[PDB]
Amino acid sequence: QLFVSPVVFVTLGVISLLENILVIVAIAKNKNLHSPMYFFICSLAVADMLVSVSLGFETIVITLLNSTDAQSFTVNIDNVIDSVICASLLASICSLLSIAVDRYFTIFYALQYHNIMTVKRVGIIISCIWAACTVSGILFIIYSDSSAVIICLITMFFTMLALMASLYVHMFLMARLHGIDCSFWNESYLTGSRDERKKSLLSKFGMDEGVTFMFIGRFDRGQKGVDVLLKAIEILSSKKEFQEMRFIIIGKGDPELEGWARSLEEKHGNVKVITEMLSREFVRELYGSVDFVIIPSYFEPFGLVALEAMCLGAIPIASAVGGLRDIITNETGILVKAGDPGELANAILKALELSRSDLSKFRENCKKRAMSFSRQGANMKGAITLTILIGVFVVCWAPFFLHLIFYISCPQNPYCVCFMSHFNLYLILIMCNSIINPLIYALRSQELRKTFKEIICCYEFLEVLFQG
């Protein structure tokens, strides 16, 4: 076994104890950090502290025995120490998963999650997490020799690894796929009122002032659903309500659908078709002029199409598919069944009736919703914090869990034995998870840094009052 001085385990356990107490004290002392996310960061801080305190205390207990077997007493103390480490490891997984649940629901169902997750409900959930993890942790140490327990912990680590892989793929690799660009899609690029922007836009296409509906995307059968909209305009054609409606259809593709759109354009007059790929700057002006944006997509994994429109006040009429279903709410748009022209025609009729009242607040809801999905926003920055925290967990626990994989799969293999002999370094990396996490919380939370700065000033006064 690879030697590391017992004092390293004790000192790292002290540094972790000092750091994580400061984290728990800061969240409790500051009412600004009294949100479910920081409460789940608090349970994670307890779990981190308890792991390093138990590993530090265990090292003190082992060194004491090497200095002085003491029968069952040492085995009983070992089982209790290992149960606290197991319980806290399960609780740390549960806490990170709870921050993952917190972030997913604050990103998509912000108002809904906030009303549900009260200080009482989050207090119950954390208590239930720790109650189930202490029960499971004790049971896991009883059947530590059993494969089922070791396989369960390895599966739980592989779940966290799969969570890290999917979060890194979303937050960093797919960053520019679903991330809204607030520097470009800004209402500051628009001049005048929406009434005059719509008036000028409709006058440019030789049309009267009416409820303007806009389509942007490829002309294809089974993807962006231009066919659904073209069928819906034909359904609306017979209705008297269609005369108060205006349609701007942009995109290229299928000559069959291009020719269909151009045929309805010359047939109705309130229908305008641009069979050209327009510049994002002009699409932005269209989003800020039109009343509604119709996204009748059969498939749209990223709500970016709706997000871009919502930024500039355009109320989206999209399909309840992928990202559109997630981004659009009752307050921020109208959702319809994909591939249903009859339901879309009714949604355009609903939108026409909706426009008779003041849509000013509806657009403000769209703007506020689209704004919360920006990378510079508190919701996305928290998801990046979550990816860093899970990333740090996975990296710090990976050698231990590979050691655990090796323990049950290849304990006889010299290549596994050589890796398994550096177990003390893997425990040191577990100590580091409890030291790196408080450094991340401070780095990612400006408010927690401020509260930490108040404790270093109060500790200077504590030591001053201690001597005098």
């Binding site: 385990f9 590993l55 265990e58 085995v75 480490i85 050691h403 655990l404 177990f423 425990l427």
Partner: peptide, 7 residues
């Protein structure tokens, strides 16, 4: 008894 478990 040793440091951690499954060493």
């Amino acid at each position: 008894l040793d440091h951690x478990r499954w060493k």
